[PDB]
């Protein structure tokens, strides 16, 4: 029914801790697999933290919050999501100070929020900039995802695709340097070819099919037209259908259907275009004028998809076709091609311009290999987004965790009060990240984690992390495990903000 008292906070901890214990071993390159018993007796042997929790049923609402916060991470950053839940579960797993010591959550939350400002400052100290102009460094950075994948045979290809693609979308002139991979980097697959044939189209590719053969097959100077209205007979304000029974009234309603569709098409062809792109559908009578005009018929193109076209070829959006002025012409466009590349038509309006958007062409030998190349390239685009938004990397392999933990432990010495105890407990929670990397490799956890903390005390904290493959210690200057800063800061805030959230819950109430 409901929960109240200390049972709530201790219950939310066991729920969040239980969800993290599932994916404790799903961290690093030597991640362990998980067996998911389907209801029909089947098994899925995935090792992805997002896919595991997505398929698991959870009864506690605290678990739904942990999972729903992880999904929000995937939309922004396709990496480090597993670290959020583990840290959020370890930060909450310290229930000694929470209940056994009878401290109020406001005392704990004030310490967790104080450490978060210190964890953020320490990560910027151990950071390091990157020369984004040199693509060789970004290759080593993007290899964190290409490693242990089938696309390693064309690893450099994936970097040049993702690197150059995000640079086109990056509109730095607006100050904030916003990037939109979902809209301005729309990806579409093309059957045929191989992995090497994968490239980036410098334009906008529409997957519209060819309905008739009377369409422009190859053009050197396209002329694209844009409009939102539909090419059909003007209906009434309501959706009332036209019901007719008298034959004499048919020719009247038919003539009204033909003339208005006729006059609207006559104005579209006055500019001598090569393709009519409309947002809404195009009826059969309207297509009879497009095939007669020897121009391509295109429809069902969204607003943002049309906005990129006007920036590419120089077209102009109009409400209706009747108001089409001479400005709506795609002069300077590269070419218009509706070739059937791999048993599927593809509209290419590429040009020699970068209209703050592009389209990625995924060539491949089969749908299985195409999907493998697809999901592997999206993460590379996001790593390029995170580095280009904030070109600062921090040492990975558990080094940034141990480096930050030493700063809090040394800073807690001057922390007079009861908040020093949970403030230090957050530092010991960061050690769980190398604790799992060492557990997966099989090396002794206590022996290496003890020596690992000693290296950060004496030697510089910017290096001396952990090697997940070998298990021994290694400097991140010698091993390119450097991860972005924006991923770690958002990973650290989301873990503390999530733990602060569940700690603020004291009564699970039902009602609507």
């Amino acid at each position: 029914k409901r929960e109240s008292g200390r049972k709530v906070q201790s219950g939310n901890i066991n729920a969040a801790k239980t969800i993290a214990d599932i994916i404790r071993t799903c961290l690093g390159p030597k991640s362990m697999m998980k067996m998911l018993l389907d209801p029909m007796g089947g098994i899925v042997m995935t090792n992805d933290g997002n896919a595991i929790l997505r398929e698991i049923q959870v009864q506690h609402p605290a678990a739904k919050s942990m999972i729903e916060i992880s999904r929000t991470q995937d939309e922004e950053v396709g990496d480090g999501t597993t670290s959020v839940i583990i840290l959020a579960g370890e930060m909450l797993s310290v229930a000694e100070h929470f209940l056994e010591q009878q401290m109020h959550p406001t005392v704990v939350i004030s310490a967790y929020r104080k450490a978060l400002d210190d964890m953020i400052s320490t990560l910027k100290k151990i950071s390091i900039p990157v020369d984004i102009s040199d693509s060789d460094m970004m290759l080593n950075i993007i290899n964190s995802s290409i490693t242990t994948k089938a696309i390693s045979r064309w690893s450099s290809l994936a970097c040049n695709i993702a690197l150059d693609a995000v640079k086109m979308v990056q509109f730095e002139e607006n100050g904030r340097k916003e990037i939109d991979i979902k809209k301005y980097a729309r990806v579409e697959k093309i059957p045929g070819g191989i992995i090497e044939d994968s490239c980036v189209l410098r334009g906008v590719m529409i997957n519209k099919d060819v309905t008739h053969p009377r369409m422009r097959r190859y053009i050197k100077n396209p002329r694209i037209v844009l409009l939102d209205s539909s090419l059909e007979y003007k209906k009434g304000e309501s959706q009332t259908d036209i019901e007719i029974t008298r034959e004499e009234d048919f020719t009247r309603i038919l003539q009204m259907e033909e003339e208005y569709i006729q006059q609207l098409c006559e104005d579209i062809i006055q500019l001598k275009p090569d393709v009519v792109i409309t947002e809404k559908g195009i009826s059969d009578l309207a297509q009879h004028y497009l095939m007669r005009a020897n121009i391509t018929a295109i429809r069902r193109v969204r607003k943002t998809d049309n906005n990129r076209i006007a920036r590419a070829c120089g077209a102009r959006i109009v409400s209706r076709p009747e108001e089409l002025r001479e400005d709506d012409v795609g002069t300077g466009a590269g070419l218009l091609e509706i070739k059937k590349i791999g048993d599927e038509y593809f509209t290419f309006i590429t040009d020699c311009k970068d209209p703050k958007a592009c389209t990625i062409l995924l060539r491949g030998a089969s749908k299985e290999i195409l999907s493998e190349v697809e999901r592997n390239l999206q993460d590379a685009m996001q790593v390029c987004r995170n580095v280009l938004l904030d070109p600062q990397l921090v040492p990975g392999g558990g080094a940034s965790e141990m480096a930050v933990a030493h700063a809090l432990t040394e800073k807690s010495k001057a922390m007079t009060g009861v908040e020093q105890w949970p403030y230090r407990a957050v530092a010991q929670a960061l050690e769980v990240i190398p604790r799992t990397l060492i557990q997966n490799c099989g090396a002794s956890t206590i022996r290496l984690l003890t020596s690992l903390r000693a290296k950060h005390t004496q030697e510089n904290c910017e290096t001396w992390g952990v090697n997940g493959e070998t298990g021994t210690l290694v400097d991140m200057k010698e091993l390119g495990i450097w991860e972005p800063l924006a991923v770690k800061l958002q990973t650290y805030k989301t873990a503390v903000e999530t733990a602060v959230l569940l700690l603020r819950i004291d009564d699970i109430v039902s009602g609507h």
């Binding site: 066991n14 801790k17 239980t18 214990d21 599932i22 071993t25 030597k30 362990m32 697999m33 998980k34 067996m35 998911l36 018993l37 389907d38 209801p39 007796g41 089947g42 098994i43 899925v44 042997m45 090792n47 595991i52 398929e55 698991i56 049923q57 959870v58 009864q59 506690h60 678990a63 997966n440 490799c441 099989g442 070998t470």
Partner: protein, 521 residues
């Protein structure tokens, strides 16, 4: 630590659940390894019985109760799709790999350390396979040893010489000048009313539907093959008309006019028959897929034509590439350029049905292997053995290298791994030792099924050492060592190659399983 309506195995006992399933599946399939191995029955529940030793059939068609064991069954499907052999030996090595790993995992060893040893033992075992393979030329004497080695594992040691010569000759007819090979060129037919040993080859092709008229020729020693797809039965009016009648007889009178479009096209058939060698000591055959009217059949039958009707898409496909007759979709464009040619064309009468045979062709690029048996399941068992025998001869021809059998490669690779110090990690050799002992399960099981001691057989073949290339195997009749290359036992290079790639990947992934969770089960 779990939500309601679910379950979770947190500790390492989840791994023991997967090890127990593989150990159980090992003990099931080990009794059907090799020729002397037993057979397993597949009761479909409806009442159909089926006996077979093919591990792919005992895992794909047989549904497995345990959830974990069904995963390994899907791999046997994947193993059969690449090489078509080794599915049984794949499961036995997986069962022993996980068995040997549990001995060290119980001592506190992590699974990830053992899997890194398998990756090292695989590369060493893969390099040693390159040295043992024999790249000799493939001759009829060699492929017979391959076909016998592949067919004796699926039959009662009586259909060996029967299906061996058929399986070998079927392949040699479809490869010359280093051309790429395709097993789809060989058709597999099944017929009853004869003993199991009545299997033989068919150089031509078998057709289902035969001629239907008393005046037909039972055999045509020569004829031009005319491919067609036009319905010579009663069809609708082909012109813009309808049914303008006043009674039933007037409706029937218009059907005569509707038959004018078909009846005249029958004369066009008779015309080209009389034109293209319609003289004495000659014949003509029509293979029209669609139906033919009884009255129209009377016209062609009296002219000495052996007509056929209501054929399948597969028959017309092979009939075209074999005979060369191009399909005419309308008799208006009838011409002699679309005509083929063939030798003997006859219909062998069985006790119940009949089938048309088009044997004695020059180079049809397609043949047929006619299987004969008394029962239904026996024909299916022989169909599987031929497909496994053809794919075995295919691999030996495509991949010109072959390797010895009878566990001689497994015994040699195991000795090489033991004679291999660590190179990736100190503790990795524990997995290399487990990989070595896992390979020895193959000669161990061959000694069990043959009825000999498991330990005496393996120790004798291991003691064979000399200052020269020496590869001994398990003699199923004697039990003593036996040079598999001398007696004529040869396995493919892709079979042993894919075993190491398939065994290591699955034995690795099953070891990396830390927890077993219910996804709403």
């Amino acid at each position: 630590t779990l939500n309601p309506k679910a379950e979770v195995a947190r500790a390492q006992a989840a791994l023991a659940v997967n090890i127990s399933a593989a150990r159980g599946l090992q003990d099931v399939l080990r009794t059907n390894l090799g020729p002397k191995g037993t057979m397993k029955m597949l009761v479909s529940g409806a009442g159909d019985i089926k006996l077979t030793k093919d591990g792919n059939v005992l895992l794909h068609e047989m549904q497995i109760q345990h959830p974990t064991a069904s995963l390994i069954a899907k791999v046997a499907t994947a193993q059969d799709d690449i090489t078509g052999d080794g599915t049984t030996s794949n499961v036995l090595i997986i069962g022993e790999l996980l068995k040997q790993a549990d001995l060290y995992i119980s001592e506190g060893l992590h699974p990830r350390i053992i899997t890194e040893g398998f990756e090292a033992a695989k590369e060493k075992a893969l390099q040693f396979l390159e040295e043992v393979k024999v790249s000799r030329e493939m001759d009829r004497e060699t492929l017979i040893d391959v076909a016998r080695t592949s067919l004796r594992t699926k039959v009662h040691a009586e259909l060996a010489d029967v299906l061996t010569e058929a399986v070998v000759d079927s392949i040699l007819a479809i490869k010359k000048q280093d051309e790429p090979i395709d097993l789809f060129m060989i058709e597999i037919m099944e017929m009853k009313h004869k003993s199991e040993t009545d299997t033989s080859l068919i150089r031509g092709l078998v057709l289902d539907h035969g001629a239907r008229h008393p005046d037909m020729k039972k055999r045509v020693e020569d004829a031009y093959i005319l491919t067609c797809n036009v319905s010579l039965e009663y069809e609708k009016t082909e012109v813009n008309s309808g049914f303008f009648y006043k009674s039933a007889e007037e409706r029937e009178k218009l059907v005569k006019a509707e038959r004018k479009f078909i009846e005249d096209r029958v004369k066009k058939i008779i015309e080209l028959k009389r034109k293209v060698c319609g003289d004495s000591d000659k014949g003509f055959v029509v293979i029209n897929q669609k139906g033919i009217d009884p009255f129209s059949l009377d016209a062609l039958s009296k002219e000495g034509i052996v007509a056929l009707r209501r054929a399948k898409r597969r028959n017309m496909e092979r009939l075209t590439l074999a005979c060369g007759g191009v399909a005419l979709n309308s008799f208006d464009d009838l011409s002699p350029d679309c005509l083929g040619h063939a030798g003997l064309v006859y219909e062998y009468t069985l006790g119940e049905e009949k089938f048309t045979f088009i044997e004695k062709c020059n180079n049809p690029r397609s043949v047929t292997l006619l299987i004969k048996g008394p029962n239904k399941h026996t024909l299916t068992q022989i169909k599987d053995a031929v497909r496994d025998g053809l794919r075995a001869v295919k691999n030996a021809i495509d991949d010109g290298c072959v390797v010895p059998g009878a566990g001689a490669v497994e015994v040699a690779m195991a000795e090489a791994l033991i004679k291999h110090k660590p190179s990736v990690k100190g503790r990795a050799q524990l997995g290399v030792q487990a990989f070595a002992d896992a390979l020895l399960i193959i000669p161990k099981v061959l000694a069990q099924n043959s009825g000999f001691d498991l330990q005496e057989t393996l120790v004798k073949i291991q003691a064979e050492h000399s200052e020269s290339g020496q590869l001994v195997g398990v003699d199923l009749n004697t039990g003593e060592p036996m040079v598999a290359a001398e007696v004529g036992v040869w396995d493919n290079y892709c079979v042993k190659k894919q075993l190491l790639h398939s065994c290591t990947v699955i034995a690795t992934n099953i070891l990396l399983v830390d927890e077993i969770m219910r996804a709403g089960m």
